[PDB]
Symmetry: none
Subunit: 65 residues, 14 copies
């Protein structure tokens, strides 16, 4: 029951994102961590504090590029 992300990466493109899960804080992890799954299947971690990540999340809800 440790954190799934060791670190954060950046440069994620919205077109490639097949799914984006937001895992908040708790006994499982010290901080909130976001895991984005691409269309090929490879997962990639993201920063919830980052402005691009927050911009990407709200765009997925409204409508896709």
């Amino acid at each position: 029951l440790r954190c799934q992300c060791l670190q954060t990466m950046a440069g994620i493109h919205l077109k490639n994102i097949q799914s984006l899960c937001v895992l908040p804080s708790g006994p499982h992890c010290t901080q909130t961590e976001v895991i984005a799954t691409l269309k090929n299947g490879r997962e990639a971690c993201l920063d919830p504090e980052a402005p691009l990540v927050q911009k990407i999340v709200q765009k997925m809800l409204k409508g896709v590029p």
Copy 2:
């Protein structure tokens, strides 16, 4: 490869949410659909257009329920 949510429900509380995945449009589904997994394990579908759902998502990224 059909849509996972048959319908949307409401009245979700942030404290109970263990994970929230956002599945956008594509060949798999006609519209964007959001699936929230609670701490007990039971999943529940949400509306991306809904104002509460959008408010819940941004709050999870920043900080605590």
Copy 3:
């Protein structure tokens, strides 16, 4: 026999890298692509042209931080 990486990401830390495979050009892919596997197990793609990536690769050969 298509390319394994849809895109490149950045911000990789050397300490977290458990393995780094370099897949060159051929019938399988138009360009060279690098796939780094972290200690947790999650893979992440990298740019061979990038200066940090080239600096990370040579450091792994000589000796770890």
Copy 4:
């Protein structure tokens, strides 16, 4: 969780290399070890200290002959 390479071999040609993975030090192994997979499928171990191996790695990143 022991080292995958018992020994090192030499005389590797760049044209034949389909993939080259660099596995650094850790709990898994005492030293850094490099595993090159050929186009036929047969794997072969390499020395990270060797000058040819270091020359082969940097050439794969830049471009193929």
Copy 5:
């Protein structure tokens, strides 16, 4: 009808590590004789039959191991 199993030859093989050494001669399958040595971990590695070390390694395996 098969092609040759070895694309190239490598060297620096140690006798202690060799678990098995198969010698595949010429024929319809391949233009030249090719030797495939399987190590104790399981990883295979190709060898040169013309090489003096390889010929010295083969005869030593028959007589008795180091």
Copy 6:
């Protein structure tokens, strides 16, 4: 992990040999044992001490009859 050969046979002809594997001593077997696979597919065991067998092995390396 017992010995593959129960006994040795003789009268092997070089022309018929498709492959000759030499399995040395270890935990798997008390003595070194040689297994020759013919062109039809039928395997046959050989004596490493035998002079003909040693003469056959060196001839395969140099060049075929």
Copy 7:
């Protein structure tokens, strides 16, 4: 429907023989050929003309060593 044995071998021991099949002449083969299956499972061809082979066959019928 060709001959199963490319050649004959010798030095077979009766104790090791689990089964011995005698395949006579016909459209399938130019001459009579004998195939002995050992207890481990490995088959081995024999000469019907050979005196030891004929002595081995008659001994199996009467009673085993």
Copy 8:
């Protein structure tokens, strides 16, 4: 791993025999048992003690009618 023959039969003709296998004693069976396969495919058991059977076996080795 029981005996393959429940009983013995007689009146076998050499011309009809396509194959004759001799299965000696062991853990598999209390006594030696002979199984003759005819040209049509139907198997038939034989007595190793019988004089005709022993005469049939030696004739197959030398040369067929």
Copy 9:
């Protein structure tokens, strides 16, 4: 559509017989031929003219 039995054998025991089929004459074969299948599975041909075979067949009908 040739005859299934190349020859006849003898020494069949009733206890071992699991099934006994009688295939009469016709375009398929010049003469009547009997095929007995044992309990292990191995088939064996029999002579319909033979006295033991005729005695074995009638005994199977009445009782083992």
Copy 10:
């Protein structure tokens, strides 16, 4: 491994019978059951106790109508 015949029928003609199999008692069935296969291919069950059936069987052995 139950009985193949649920019941017996009668009125079988010898001319139509292509094959007649007699399956005796055992673990497979409580009583002896006879299965007659006609020239068209359709099977039909018979009573071993019946006088016509016993008369039909003996006639097939001697010679056909």
Copy 11:
């Protein structure tokens, strides 16, 4: 396109019948022929003229 039944048999029991098909006359056959399939799977031919067969058919329609 010949007749499926070479002959008729009798002694059919209603309890065992899983299906009963009635194939009338035509180019395919000179006369009407009835084919009854049992619960085990083995087919058996019947006479349409026979009184038992006609009695069996009407009983299947009404009730088992």
Copy 12:
């Protein structure tokens, strides 16, 4: 192993019937069901209780 007929239809003509199978009750179906196959090949379900169907069946047995 469900019932083959979802419903019954009527207006079947005897001349068109190539085959008529009667499938009685059991584990396979709650009630008896009759399946008539026409000369063109198209199957059609029938009611065993119906008077015309019972009249059609007996007529096929006697003669076309």
Copy 13:
């Protein structure tokens, strides 16, 4: 095989709307002397219908509006 004749030898009746999975209407032409309707049920068994019949015409219009 039989090429370009009428598919229905006769008409039947007593069709229920609930059971109908598909209903095809094949009009007149070189293929057939009269219009013929072929209804395919949910189990898969086809059944012919009369276009002149009042129930059949009532069934067709009901399928278009709603089940």
Copy 14:
């Protein structure tokens, strides 16, 4: 392939009765959300139609009566 989805992505119009070789009406169910009509022309090319449309309903009843 696409198993058990709707066969028509959209509806078209301007169908002429003379060209129609066959007209199948596929109602609602697990296979599709709404009723959909597929008309096959004499050349072989299929074309989808609206069951709600007045021309389509007029075309269907005319095929039953006579061409």
